[PDB]
Amino acid sequence: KGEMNLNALFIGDKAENGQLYKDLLIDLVDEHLGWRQNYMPQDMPVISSQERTSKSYEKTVNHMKDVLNEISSRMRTHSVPWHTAGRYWGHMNSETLMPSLLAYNFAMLWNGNNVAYESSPATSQMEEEVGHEFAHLMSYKNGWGHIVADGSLANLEGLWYARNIKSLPFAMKEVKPELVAGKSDWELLNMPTKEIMDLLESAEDEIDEIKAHSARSGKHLQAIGKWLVPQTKHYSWLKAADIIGIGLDQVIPVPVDHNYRMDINELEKIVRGLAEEQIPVLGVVGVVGSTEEGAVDSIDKIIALRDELMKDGIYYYVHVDAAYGGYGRAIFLDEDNNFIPYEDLQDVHEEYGVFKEKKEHISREVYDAYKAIELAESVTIDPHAMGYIPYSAGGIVIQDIRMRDVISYFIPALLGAYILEGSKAGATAASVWAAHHVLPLNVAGYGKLIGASIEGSHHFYNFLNDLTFKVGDKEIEVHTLTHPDFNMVDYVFKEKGNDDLVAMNKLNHDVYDYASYVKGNIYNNEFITSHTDFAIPDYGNSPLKFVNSLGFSDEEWNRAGKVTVLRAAVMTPYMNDKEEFDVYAPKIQAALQEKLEQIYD
Amino acid sequence: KGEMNLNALFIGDKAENGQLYKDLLIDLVDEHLGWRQNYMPQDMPVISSQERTSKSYEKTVNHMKDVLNEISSRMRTHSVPWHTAGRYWGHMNSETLMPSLLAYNFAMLWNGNNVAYESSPATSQMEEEVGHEFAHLMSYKNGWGHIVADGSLANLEGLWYARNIKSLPFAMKEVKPELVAGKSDWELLNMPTKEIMDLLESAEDEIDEIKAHSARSGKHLQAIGKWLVPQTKHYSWLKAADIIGIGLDQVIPVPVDHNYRMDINELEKIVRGLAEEQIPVLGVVGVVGSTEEGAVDSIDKIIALRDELMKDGIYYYVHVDAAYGGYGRAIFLDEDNNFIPYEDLQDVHEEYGVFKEKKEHISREVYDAYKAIELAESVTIDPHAMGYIPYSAGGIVIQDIRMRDVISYFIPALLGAYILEGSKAGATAASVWAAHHVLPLNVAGYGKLIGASIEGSHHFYNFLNDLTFKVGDKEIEVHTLTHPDFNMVDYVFKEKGNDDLVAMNKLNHDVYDYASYVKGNIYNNEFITSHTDFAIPDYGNSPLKFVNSLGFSDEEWNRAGKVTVLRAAVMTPYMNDKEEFDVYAPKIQAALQEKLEQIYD
Ligand SMILES: Cc1ncc(COP(=O)(O)O)c(CNCCc2ccc(O)c(O)c2)c1O
Ligand SMILES: Cc1ncc(COP(=O)(O)O)c(CNCCc2ccc(O)c(O)c2)c1O
Ligand SMILES: [Mg+2]
Ligand SMILES: [Mg+2]
Description:
2 copies of one chain form a homodimer. Chain A is α/β, with parallel strands linked by helices and about 600 residues long. Helices cover about 40% and strands about 10% of the residues of chain A. Chain A folds into 3 domains: about 1-95, no CATH class; about 95-445, no CATH class; about 445-600, no CATH class. Chain A has 19 helices and 12 strands. Chain A has a 7-stranded mixed beta sheet with strand order 1-7-6-5-4-2-3, sandwiched between helices. In chain A, a hairpin with a 7-residue loop joins strand 9 and strand 10. Chains A and B meet through helix 1, helix 2, helix 3, helix 4 and helix 5 of A and helix 1, helix 2, helix 3, helix 4 and helix 5 of B. One magnesium ion binds near residues 509, 531 and 533 of chain A.
């Protein structure tokens, strides 16, 4: 039964459900104040009745009102209207799920600390469950997970896992070489991750000593190997190296295709090349849902190469960075957590309400990529991304629960023993738990929400291709960068006969200026988007096919050095129906017209 | 004018101000829904009237209600009643400030991302100000700061600063040795931090290259030196080494006194000893407000030694870990941000309402320690500690704004360039900003809140000393560990004639069991506290004077190996008046009596 109305789980583009929120809000608030009053009910209120009616109180209350009135003016002047159903087409931001907003404020009134069960016996039991729901979303059979502060710190917590794991073999040589007897110092730096715990767990009475000689000691950080990341990586990855101690100098970027997914052949060249030079590979990162392109790296083809190289004695750790796309894997899961066969996807999506038109919306490349995330050792998934949970809430999931003992310090009692950070809000766990439990992590819940964002991005794609604008005696047309592998549709504007790639980049960068906070009050902006510069230094000639299809030469490309593209991670849940989009399409067009008519007069 | 009622800035032990909260809550909510409706007011609500009255909606709304009703049952069964005015005497948890709770929920409805101004043009302008308010709280003249996820990640961000800074000299040798010409490879690893930027800023066109050869490269992580921390350190510090790459093996614990503050003489022995062996010192951490003892390390005496050793060619970075105590430095600041002279403290505290009895409440040791934090390079301050802001919100403050260029990547535009983490809630900034602006960070605001927690801890101290309990034909008495240097009062229970330190530890650890979530429903617990085990491995014979004053020999001490103490970081704002405490004292005593009468029958 796809009978869930997603339009009820949101306050609304025009606050249509504002009464629902306020009623559920005050109903939850009143339940908390009642708990308080009934804790030791023999206790008399300390704040007297006469004090609550005194001038001391009024002057203090009237100042809180004045401070909140200042906060309100500033929030209502500068904040971004990404609640609009179809005028915000930019960053990874729309509305957030009402069940999470309500459960956060409700839980914040108890202000539990998840670092220790004794300061959160209930929100910590939620995060335990939230952790298993993450693992089952990844089809891990004995995995685990927890809520991270943000995705950048979950990528770091992953590299922490890797960095420590590559070093464990060497350390079992120095502490109990009976575990790695007969193993060359290259065989040690290329052991599969499953073998390492199966050994680490074997040495029961020595786990603690073995870990003391790990990378936790501070040594073997240049021996563990190089970190391989897509050329289109997030800065979290460059900084993660800096902090973990591998170094930004030991980070190798693997070139990307013209779909801006890692070239699996260029990946091979590098891994084999490094082993001929006898340098190990600490790990590779597969990006399911890129930052500026919305690209899904082929996890299926990364773990394939690893399975082929594992016969030539070369193993790599795979960490999937699904900060954006992690929650989209529920669109692939049935109500039993079994992965829908591709042949039955369009059919099942139609019976559950995931998609409104029974077409192909997802590729077998993206489907198989998502399915192979189950064979990687850790994944980064951000609830404050495609989970529709408010900031600040990220996630990390590990394939094997035992893997947390490689970073462990001394329910998971102090769950801060098995995490990188420390104090955590139990209210952030309640907001995630609530979302996962109102919206199941399969096609009966989040599947429908992910699907509305995807289908809404596809209407945006076809709307942009057909777009042409006559501004004066000029004719500007809009070009899409690539076919969306998820919900991010990228686009550029170009003068019909202008072979200047420098000028095309000044058109797009002026459109951003008028469709952002830069030019004008944003409360009067009828269209808002994002901008990104793809530059040869960090992207290569990956954007050359596209720039060439627009009339640009490899000489103008190598001159300008960058193509400025406009980004639209479509996360609106109100643009799945073509009829609703067709209502806001004329409004996006009337805005982009007037914006273009203002940078040319 | 100390005319601020702090009893209005809290919901209340018995929800006395619950209407105030609900009224201000719904008033702020309605202001947000109005902004939304007036963004592009020509737009028609997409959720139809007929849909909001359809069965699809009801069934989905009725399930959200069912999920929230489950969350509510679990939160109202297991959460801890630290709202009570005088029955919770344990962890660093009481109520939170109403202005922050309101401003967080208000700002969460916009869900801005502080990693980039374009996704938070208002909550990022608040965090900029929140950052300067941190720096002025530390009497920095050209400092900076920002909100961290938690204190453990702010300690790490500090060590990141240090780790990179010690390495900069070596790197200016490899990139522009004209900056460090004539400087021995020991003089480089012992340059004062001010000299390093004054040089780093001098090399304008080479900053980026110089940083590429820093610890960011991955090299010189064992050359930068050893990290010195108090024996009574937080685990954040052990883990910070692991992650930053210095190693848990390059961490030297400096022994603590019997006041459990670093022995400044034992500190000297180590620093000079290390330089005779030619090992540099990466930095020392001074703990203003310890975890289990509430101890304030002598910052005044740490920066003194550094000023004396800086003539023998030995410099150390000082980072103050004031996660707990950071906000208590406002009790020392007048309304002009000038540090009150100790001679005038009791007087000024009486005219502003900070203390209710004109006694001495703070020592010149703690006063001068707080005042010398101004000469350390970075400080960790947690709003979710003595700032009374709800989780999750920590802080880091740096003495020199330019110091952020040593970790910088590419208003502070992307403030995520000058931070360790990434995505941040702008709502966490609004809750901190609101608190700082309802409660000024001097004696006219937070001074009064800190003072009520201190004075409330002192009544707890004198209440425990005089405490004796006749349980059966036995007589148990209560002993305080040390005189509170802040708001944490520690205590032990002991059988009058029992020379067993093992048994005394089983009395206290059984009291914890009955005064915690362990034994019984916590909604029927009339007293809740915390427990900690001070063990020779990590504390030394620091607890020997105390264990000796109770009738224990150095042989029973060395046998048991640990003393179990009960911890009470008194953060209640309702125990400053002796009359109010004297109302809850009989209730703490009746509870501890019945608890003791249950572990002995
Ligand atoms: C694939 C991938 N991994 C990690 C990150 C960073 O995750 P964080 O949660 O931010 O730590 C990202 C990029 N995420 C961009 C998030 C974002 C959201 C709103 C904004 O306004 C801005 O500027 C950025 C990623 O793609
Ligand atoms: C001096 C000092 N520095 C850092 C920390 C850790 O800071 P975090 O904000 O937690 O990252 C601490 C210890 N803080 C204990 C915090 C706390 C609060 C509520 C609880 O229920 C528990 O268990 C812990 C510190 O003292
Ligand atoms: Mg640009
Ligand atoms: Mg114990």
